[PDB]
Amino acid sequence: GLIVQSLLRLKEPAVLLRCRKDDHHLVESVLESAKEEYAQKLQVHPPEILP
Amino acid sequence: LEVAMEYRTVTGVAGPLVILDKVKGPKYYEIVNIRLGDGTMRRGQVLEVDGEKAVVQVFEGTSGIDNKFTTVQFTGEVLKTPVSLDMLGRIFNGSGKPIDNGPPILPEAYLDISGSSINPSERTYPEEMIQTGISTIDVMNSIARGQKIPLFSAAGLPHNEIAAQICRQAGLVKRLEKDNFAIVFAAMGVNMETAQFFKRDFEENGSMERVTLFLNLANDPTIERIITPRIALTTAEYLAYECGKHVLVILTDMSSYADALREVSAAREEVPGRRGYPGYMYTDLAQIYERAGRIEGRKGSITQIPILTMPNDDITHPTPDLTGYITEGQIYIDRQLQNRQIYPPINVLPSLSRLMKSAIGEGMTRRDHSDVSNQLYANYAIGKDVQAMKAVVGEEALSSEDLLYLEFLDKFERKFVAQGAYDSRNIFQSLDLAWTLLRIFPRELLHRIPGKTLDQYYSR
Amino acid sequence: EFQRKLAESSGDSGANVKRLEQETEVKIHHLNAGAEKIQYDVVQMLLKHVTTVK
Amino acid sequence: YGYVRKVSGPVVIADGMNGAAMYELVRVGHDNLIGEIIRLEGDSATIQVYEETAGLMVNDPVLRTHKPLSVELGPGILGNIFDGIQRPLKTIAIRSGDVYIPRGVSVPALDKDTLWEFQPKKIGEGDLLTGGDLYATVFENSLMQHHVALPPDAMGKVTYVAPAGQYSLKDTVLELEFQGVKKSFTMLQAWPVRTPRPVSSKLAADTPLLTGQRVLDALFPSVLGGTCAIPGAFGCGKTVISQALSKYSNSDTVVYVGCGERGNEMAEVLMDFPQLTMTLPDGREESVMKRTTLVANTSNMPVAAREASIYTGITIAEYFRDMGYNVSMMADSTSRWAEALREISGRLAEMPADSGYPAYLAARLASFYERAGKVKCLGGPERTGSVTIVGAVSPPGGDFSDPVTSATLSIVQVFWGLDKKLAQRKHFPSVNWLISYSKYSTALESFYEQFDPDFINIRTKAREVLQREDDLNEIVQLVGKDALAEGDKITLETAKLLREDYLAQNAFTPYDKFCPFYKSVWMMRNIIHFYNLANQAVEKGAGMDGQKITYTLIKHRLGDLFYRLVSQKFEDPAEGEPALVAKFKKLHEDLTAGFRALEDETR
């Protein structure tokens, strides 16, 4: 939810991403699932975020 | 549920303004926080916003700002203020940071400063009366609940000392006629010595429970001086209408507030208004004053007593003339009386209150109050004329009545005008003193005094 | 007479100090009792913490 | 690092800054003219030259010093002459034999090589120390004990303290340990010219300045560590009042920071600093150069230096107040300083608010004038100093509604308004007793009470007499003196007596050079007592006589007392306070005998 919200608010083609070193793997699992959610949320081409 | 976006696109630093480059949908007066590269935290207010570019005026100056290493966090809140009942008895900085070595206030509610104006239908005429303590104002130009009276003064006149005296000696007349009273004291651009004077006066006041003291120093940022009247009037509005308390607001040296408005207008790069001061000063001072009134719905009311310094020792200056046009009273501080060393330098002859009749009544104040006010005013004018006559003719040609007027003026200046800085007189006591002054005239001589009222009191 | 009045005033000041201490103790007791509501206020915050969605 | 893009007088644009700090000092060109940033626009920056700018070139290198403007604080600043850029002028003239000041000269503010003795204050190893702790003292000269102190942003444990000895400035003497780091220290410390030195607490002033001039000391008193305002007129004031502060003031040190002024006057006064010693110490004659420091920037100096010099002076004053010494800052500037602000605003293309003055003039003046007060210092032991500010404004001839004047009178508590008419009247003190005012009156109540309780009432009576004279001057000009009564006659006599004996102080004579408070209070008491006795005499008016007849009689019968009231000025203060007090008490007793025998004779 947090990623999706941040992507919606920031609303730019390419971004970076910083998170805690631990849980990065499940962050990776969240990643792309969110990107798809963002692309579906508004009629835009899915962003480059490959963070 | 919304989190701030910390921009780091500082592009261009000019004077007291810092400009951001790419800000996604800024608000106009969204308050904004700036972290220096060294880590110092300085606040600021967002000014005019263009398309994705926002210009920011910051407090505490612009020193230390770097284009690459300064980050700008956008709060997105338009300068809310915490206000609550317990705010009383504490001293606050220009922005509102508690300087009384006390805990930060726990907010009853967050309020927008520059609150929306009262529906004029809800306004009611001024009523009742309030004891300024100083007998001259209490009698000559009285002030009733709901009446906005400024106090014109000049640099070097003890305007601030008189304001502190009013703060100490303020109280409802209705107590004598038979705790809802409150004072929001906002001081704008006061000097360090006067700041210490106010702080000590509050420390040994003995009336802290009913007084809150907004304080904005000269060293404080100019925008803080601008916002100090706003937060002061907001707190007063809460404590008066939302809390049902009569409220007396004192604003000191609003010339500083006008100067700060001039500064911010120049910062906008807008053309200066007529006579140097900004054109919008009329609207600004109207918004500052018009918040004073009596609401029909709420028992509480607001009285506004700005202490406006008159530049060049005259009211011809744009700000004194403008505030006189807006407001409905003019009490004056005579330079000669201070030069003649009368601690209240009140200029009784220039002093006037438009709603004097409403303040004076039978239920509130005594019936003879207005009569003795008029009689003393006329007799004082006659005494000044007779003093001129004594000067020009050598005082031998004067009749007995002329000597009576002369001695009346002398006793008036000796006793009624001069008041102890800590001496407090109830309005009944002030009327008694004026009557004691009046006994020296014969009964027939008091032409202004109505019949059956003269014999009521002249008997003594 | 002034010395008698001053002794009375000192006694009154001491009694006022004691009454203020008692009132402060009562207020502290009320604040401590407020911890019961504070415990639920914490989870209320946590609820409004996670209301962030989408 | 960076290169110039645009040169227009003091304004010099330098593209290629990218990351640069607001007000960071940057050196420009081969000559390395030191300048500060005033306006960022992106990669570009705006730099005031602080020097002559003719002869720059596009693509000339610009280097960042990364540090804001700072003045080297340490032993050896007293009795030295500095430009606004903190340059020892005498050192420049000696090292380079040329009489001129070379363009872009880089000389340290204080000579590192010069030796100075040391004296630690029983400091022990391992002791915790804090900023502003007076750990040691140094005698820069006789009657001047420079107590070196820890920097405000410095604290730790004393691993090493130097033994007392002769040390150069570059030498380290104190080592501190804190948070597992070791910080060495030399005597010289750097402090930004803005951002006033930290203060533990600000205190309400208690003691007057007690200047040599009579009107300044009695009618318009000024407390220690308090603001002042003079219109900076010539002939007196900036020459007279300044001399009184320089040698006759009770302040331990004077920081004279004149800027934007006549060059010849400062040439003369600099020629006067080594001379004009004052024997303030009981056993030694304190040469004023020991207790003064001149920040001199003449009119030919660059415009930015006019802004910088004031802050350098106030920084030096704050430094001295940190040690507890009471120091006075006289500033002949703030008249031309507003002009400098106007110039820099005009070049920067800012929109002026009133009469061409940039709006923040008021804010900057408020900051500078509020940088002074009686302050309890930091660290141990507990000590207290003060800084007194005396800043000039536009000459009295012009309107007092000028924006600089209006801004000053808003914050300043004491205005010693000089009168052009008085100056033309050759009345040397030239202080107007109507426009001038001292808001500090209420504070000095305890001081006056403990000194002389009757002084307050006699001062009020003198003020009332002066006000009455000024008021009825118009009447007597119009109507004429014929209608004047006996009370008016004695009032005018007392007013003339004040204007001649009291408010007038030549200061070019030993009896008038300095007027101690004890002599001033006695003269005022005598004048007021004579006025009271005349009032009582004319009020009695009995025995088929009196009133104006009594006034004429006492004018002729008691003419000797009236004449020697004038000579009371000529009584030499050097004869000693007990003798002068005895003489004045005898004069008062004789005055009481007067109007008493005249009372007995009943006219």
Curated annotation (Swiss-Prot), chain A:
<protein>
    <recommendedName>
        <fullName>V-type proton ATPase subunit E</fullName>
    </recommendedName>
</protein>
<comment type="similarity">
    <text>Belongs to the V-ATPase E subunit family.</text>
</comment>
<comment type="subunit">
    <text>V-ATPase is a heteromultimeric enzyme composed of a peripheral catalytic V1 complex (components A to H) attached to an integral membrane V0 proton pore complex (components: a, c, c', c'' and d).</text>
</comment>
<comment type="function">
    <text>Subunit of the peripheral V1 complex of vacuolar ATPase essential for assembly or catalytic function. V-ATPase is responsible for acidifying a variety of intracellular compartments in eukaryotic cells.</text>
</comment>
Swiss-Prot record, chain D:
<dbReference type="Pfam" id="PF00006">
    <property type="entry name" value="ATP-synt_ab"/>
</dbReference>
<dbReference type="InterPro" id="IPR005725">
    <property type="entry name" value="ATPase_V1-cplx_asu"/>
</dbReference>
<dbReference type="InterPro" id="IPR022878">
    <property type="entry name" value="V-ATPase_asu"/>
</dbReference>
<dbReference type="Pfam" id="PF16886">
    <property type="entry name" value="ATP-synt_ab_Xtn"/>
</dbReference>
<dbReference type="InterPro" id="IPR027417">
    <property type="entry name" value="P-loop_NTPase"/>
</dbReference>
<keyword id="KW-0547">Nucleotide-binding</keyword>
<dbReference type="GO" id="GO:0016887">
    <property type="term" value="F:ATP hydrolysis activity"/>
</dbReference>
<dbReference type="InterPro" id="IPR023366">
    <property type="entry name" value="ATP_synth_asu-like_sf"/>
</dbReference>
<dbReference type="Pfam" id="PF02874">
    <property type="entry name" value="ATP-synt_ab_N"/>
</dbReference>
<dbReference type="GO" id="GO:0046034">
    <property type="term" value="P:ATP metabolic process"/>
</dbReference>
<comment type="subunit">
    <text>V-ATPase is a heteromultimeric enzyme composed of a peripheral catalytic V1 complex (main components: subunits A, B, C, D, E, and F) attached to an integral membrane V0 proton pore complex (main component: the proteolipid protein).</text>
</comment>
<keyword id="KW-0067">ATP-binding</keyword>
<dbReference type="InterPro" id="IPR000194">
    <property type="entry name" value="ATPase_F1/V1/A1_a/bsu_nucl-bd"/>
</dbReference>
<keyword id="KW-0406">Ion transport</keyword>
<dbReference type="InterPro" id="IPR055190">
    <property type="entry name" value="ATP-synt_VA_C"/>
</dbReference>
<comment type="similarity">
    <text>Belongs to the ATPase alpha/beta chains family.</text>
</comment>
<dbReference type="GO" id="GO:0005524">
    <property type="term" value="F:ATP binding"/>
</dbReference>
<feature type="binding site">
    <location>
        <begin position="232"/>
        <end position="239"/>
    </location>
    <ligand>
        <name>ATP</name>
    </ligand>
</feature>
<dbReference type="InterPro" id="IPR036121">
    <property type="entry name" value="ATPase_F1/V1/A1_a/bsu_N_sf"/>
</dbReference>
<dbReference type="InterPro" id="IPR031686">
    <property type="entry name" value="ATP-synth_a_Xtn"/>
</dbReference>
<dbReference type="InterPro" id="IPR004100">
    <property type="entry name" value="ATPase_F1/V1/A1_a/bsu_N"/>
</dbReference>
<dbReference type="InterPro" id="IPR024034">
    <property type="entry name" value="ATPase_F1/V1_b/a_C"/>
</dbReference>
